Amino acid sequence: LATTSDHDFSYLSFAYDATDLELEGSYDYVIVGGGTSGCPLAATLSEKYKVLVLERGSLPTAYPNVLTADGFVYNLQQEDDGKTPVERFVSEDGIDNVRGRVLGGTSIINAGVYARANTSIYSASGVDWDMDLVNQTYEWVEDTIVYKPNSQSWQSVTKTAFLEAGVHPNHGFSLDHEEGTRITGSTFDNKGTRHAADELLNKGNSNNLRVGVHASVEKIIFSNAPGLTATGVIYRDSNGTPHQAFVRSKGEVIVSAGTIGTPQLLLLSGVGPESYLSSLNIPVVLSHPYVGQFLHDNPRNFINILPPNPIEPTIVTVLGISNDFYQCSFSSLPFTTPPFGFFPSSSYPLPNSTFAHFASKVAGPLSYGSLTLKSSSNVRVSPNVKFNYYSNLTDLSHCVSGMKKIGELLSTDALKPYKVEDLPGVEGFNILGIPLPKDQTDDAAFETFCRESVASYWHYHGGCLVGKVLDGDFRVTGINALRVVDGSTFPYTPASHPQGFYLMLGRYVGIKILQERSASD
Ligand SMILES: Cc1cc2nc3c(=O)[nH]c(=O)nc-3n(C[C@H](O)[C@H](O)[C@H](O)COP(=O)(O)OP(=O)(O)OC[C@H]3O[C@@H](n4cnc5c(N)ncnc54)[C@H](O)[C@@H]3O)c2cc1C
Ligand SMILES: *[C@@H]1O[C@H](CO)[C@@H](O[C@@H]2O[C@H](CO)[C@@H](O[C@H]3O[C@H](CO)[C@@H](O)[C@H](O)[C@@H]3O)[C@H](O)[C@H]2NC(C)=O)[C@H](O)[C@H]1NC(C)=O
Ligand SMILES: *[C@@H]1O[C@H](CO)[C@@H](O[C@@H]2O[C@H](CO)[C@@H](O)[C@H](O)[C@H]2NC(C)=O)[C@H](O[C@@H]2O[C@@H](C)[C@@H](O)[C@@H](O)[C@@H]2O)[C@H]1NC(C)=O
Ligand SMILES: *[C@@H]1O[C@H](CO)[C@@H](O)[C@H](O)[C@H]1NC(C)=O
Ligand SMILES: N#C[C@H](O)c1ccccc1
Ligand SMILES: N#C[C@H](O)c1ccccc1
Ligand SMILES: O=Cc1ccccc1
């Protein structure tokens, strides 16, 4: 783990605005998306080769509130002017959501919860994992931006509630995703300073790594030398001037534009379903039926309580893990401006006092949808995405069990002091929004609750799966010098909170590439 310190912006020495980058550059590797996986990947590759990372968003310094824990809600509340770090979108299901648009990616605007992936998921994932390397990489990330949190009153209350409610065993402080209750790590340090993926750029070689911000990558360039190969990308700066960045022999273009951005860029570049691309007059580079398919978004269901006695805002650190659902509680100050994506719609009552948000994330999820373009030419126009929440009934069953567990928490001695009236069961609380069914044994009522109150846990992933679009080495099948490394590569969430795994993934693949270049050297 790391030690509390200011956000490290040393990498600014090699950060440039796209308008200042050359019109035509040559590198060993070009990384699209300076996000959660993108930054550590770029830093690792720069240890030996010339790397250029292209990020559409601004430097974190352009939006100071992304650098503190008490700025979390603020960023979500900010109006989307097309340049802000929080990009708003609404799935076809009608659920509000957001994604990062800034150097550091979504790790720069998230809730800071850090967890290592469930150790049992690597086995039949389609990737032959080097577990020694996986752990060395987690350590590499953790020693740079992960911290053991301060004790916090509300989180402690939540911990007592989980333990009283049978979420066992107790793991004390642990980073591992395991069944039971525990206090995990956070990317927010003990002074509330947010640390993120961008700082992993500092681990790279300052003479080999170059970062371009305000760089909108619109298309991947291909050629046959002699086989189909990615040769670079076209990106545009704030002046509307297009640039080109090419990769040299043995080099590669790696797309780390995220669950939403990666499939979008591939489609715009002619890599996707042939009939679909043709319907939009997009030249087909390679028919790839699964690009944009298998998009998953774990549903979030919750209960907001308004204690009669004020509680203090806290960062989530206490996790109550079950096999089918993951839970936690977020305490916060009241708002009069809605944080987009926090509640499912803009028409949700706002809290005028301090409140606690008990959240439940369904594992998986088994349900999935797809991503389609909204513009056949403009990469700045958000793609259409549908997740089909609860289309798979097993997900619904898990939501029911999960909300019943929340009901248990609400019925504990631990939460009694936060009720307005001493009533039986889950009754007695001042609830903001949709309350739980009073009868904890009414499954049908819980199913309706699950469906009508659903929101996004913001941990969407998939869209460019290993075994569907990519091979075990994250290469886009059928195309040379092209890989994908970010949250779009797997169908299910790796843990209650995925940033740890995606951060690790970036460097992991980076190391695999260096090992590959060593053997072929
Ligand atoms: C509100 C919120 C709270 C969250 N809280 C937590 C939490 O507490 N703990 C946790 O573990 N996880 C959390 N997550 C999820 C986690 O942050 C994400 O799963 C993770 O950051 C995704 O990593 P990524 O590398 O795939 O994508 P991203 O980090 O999003 O990175 C993709 C990058 O590509 C850029 N990009 C996209 N298209 C282009 C293009 N065409 N050209 C150039 N650049 C482009 C984007 O701007 C972005 O910087 C949260 C997510 C949200 C939205
Ligand atoms: C990669 O890291 C894994 C953790 O992220 C690690 O698994 C953990 O390994 C430790 C021992 O190194 C196990 O032991 C701990 O827990 C047991 C049971 O509770 C205690 O008896 C021990 O005293 C100790 O506290 C962990 O249980 C285990 N955790 C998990 C979730 O599996 C892997 O072994 C590492 N892999 C490699 C190849 O290094
Ligand atoms: C909901 O997700 C389940 C797990 O992915 C699906 O079941 C699985 O379906 C596989 C076929 O794609 C099959 O090989 C697995 O054995 C099976 N596993 C389980 C838990 O049964 C389920 O699909 C439906 O049920 C299975 C059993 C088959 O009959 C499928 O044809 C059904 O579609 C998913 N349900 C939905 C709504 O898709
Ligand atoms: C860990 O992953 C395995 C394999 O996918 C799964 O069976 C198990 O339920 C998961 N455990 C938890 C607590 O999520
Ligand atoms: N469990 C436990 C430890 O006391 C603990 C560890 C980290 C932060 C708060 C508290
Ligand atoms: N189970 C499961 C997920 O698909 C998964 C996620 C990351 C790595 C391996 C597997
Ligand atoms: O899982 C973390 C979290 C944080 C704030 C609101 C909901 C969930």
Q: Assign residue 494 the CATH number of its domain.
A: 3.50.50.60
For residue 13, count other CB atoms closer than 10 A to its CB. 10
Q: Letter for the amino acid at 158?
A: T
- Are 238 and 134 within one domain? yes
Gap from CA of 437 to ligand 3 centroid (Å): 29
- Cβ-based neighbour number of residue 145 at 10 Å: 30
Whether 461 and 447 map to the same domain: the answer is: no
Tell me if residue 183 falls in helix, strand or coil: strand
DSSP annotation string for 433-484: SSPPPS-TT-HHHHHHHHHHH-EE-S--EESS-BTTTB-TTSBBTT-BTEEE
Which residue puts its alpha carbon closest to atom 1 of ligand 7?
A: 328
Question: Quick check: is 214 catalytic?
Answer: no
Q: Are residues 125 and 161 in the same domain?
A: no
Q: Is 159 helix (H, G, I), strand (E, B) or coil?
A: helix
Any idea what DSSP says for residue 148? P
**437, 456, 475 - which closes a domain:** 456
Strands 369-372 and 384-385: antiparallel
Rounded to whole angstroms, what are the CA distances from 492 to 63, 355, 461? 32, 31, 7
Of 456, 479, 511, at which residue does a domain stop?
A: 456
Identify which of 516, 509, 340, 358 has the alpha carbon closest to the alpha carbon of residue 432: 358
Q: Which residue has the tokens 């009720």?
A: 419
Q: Atom 4 (ligand 6): residue with closest C-alpha?
A: 492
Q: Quote the Cα angle for 138-497-160, to 5°.
A: 110
Q: Could you tell me if the CB of 173 is within 6 A of ligand 5?
A: yes
Rounded to whole angstroms, what are the CA distances from 235 to 214, 274, 386, 497?
Answer: 9, 24, 27, 32
Which parts of 90-172 fold into alpha helices (H)? 131-145, 153-164
Residue 3 covered by a domain = no
- Euclidean distance between CA atoms 447 and 398, whole angstroms: 10
- Give the whole-angstrom CA distance, residue 162 versus residue 181: 7
Q: Clarify whether residues 23 and 112 are in a common domain.
A: yes
Q: Residue 106 annotated as binding?
A: yes
Domain-located, residue 488: yes
Question: Are 308 and 425 found together in one domain?
Answer: yes
314 and 443 part of one domain? yes
In a domain, 314, yes or no: yes
Antiparallel, parallel or unpaired: β 242-255 and 482-484: parallel
- In short, whether 129's Cβ falls inside 6 Å of ligand 5 is no
Please choose, from the candidates 153, 115, 142, the residue with its C-alpha nearest in 3D space to the C-alpha of residue 3: 142
Q: Distance from the CA of 117 to the center of ligand 1, in angstroms?
A: 17
Straight-line distance from the first to the last Cα atom of the chain, in angstroms, rounded to the nearest whole number: 35
Active-site residue (options: 177, 398, 459, 461): 459
114 and 221 housed in the same domain = yes
Domain count, the chain: 2
217 among the known binding-site residues?
yes
C-beta separation of 34 from 42 below 8 A: yes
- Position of tokens 């069990």? 401
Pocket lining: 394 vs ligand 3, CB cutoff 6 Å = yes
Distance of CA 57 to the CA centre of its chain: 16
Q: 4 in a domain, yes or no?
A: no
| Ligand 4 atom nearest to CA at 321 | 13
Q: If you take atom 16 of ligand 2, which residue's CA is the nearest one? A: 171
Task: Work out the number of other CB atoms within 10 angstroms of the CB of residue 473.
Answer: 13
Spatial separation of the C-alpha atoms in residues 410 and 449, rounded to whole Å:
16
Please check whether residues 225 and 307 belong to one and the same domain: no
* Rg of the chain on CA atoms, in Å: 22
Domain carrying residue 16: 9-146+192-297+367-389+457-521
Q: Which domain CATH number covers 421?
A: 3.30.410.40
Assigned domain for 94 exists: yes
Residue 1 falls inside a structural domain = no
Q: Say which experimental method was used.
A: X-ray
Q: Resolution limit in angstroms?
A: 1.7
Contact 231, 249 (CB under 8 A): no
Helix axis angle for 499-519 and 38-45, nearest 10°, is 30
> Strands 461-462, 293-296: parallel, antiparallel or unpaired by DSSP?
antiparallel
Q: Where a domain ends, among 422, 456, 490?
A: 456
> Does residue 155 share a domain with residue 245?
no
137 shares a domain with 276: yes
Confirm or reject: Cβ of 316 under 6 Å from ligand 7: yes
Q: Are residues 464 and 450 in the same domain?
A: no
Contact 34, 106 (CB under 8 A): no
Whether 414 and 452 share a structural domain:
yes
| Angle at the Cα of 146 from the Cα atoms of 184 and 177, rounded to 5 degrees | 35
Per DSSP, 220 falls in state E
Residue 58 has what DSSP assignment?
B
Q: Is there a catalytic annotation at residue 497? A: yes
CB atoms within 10 A of CB 503: 31
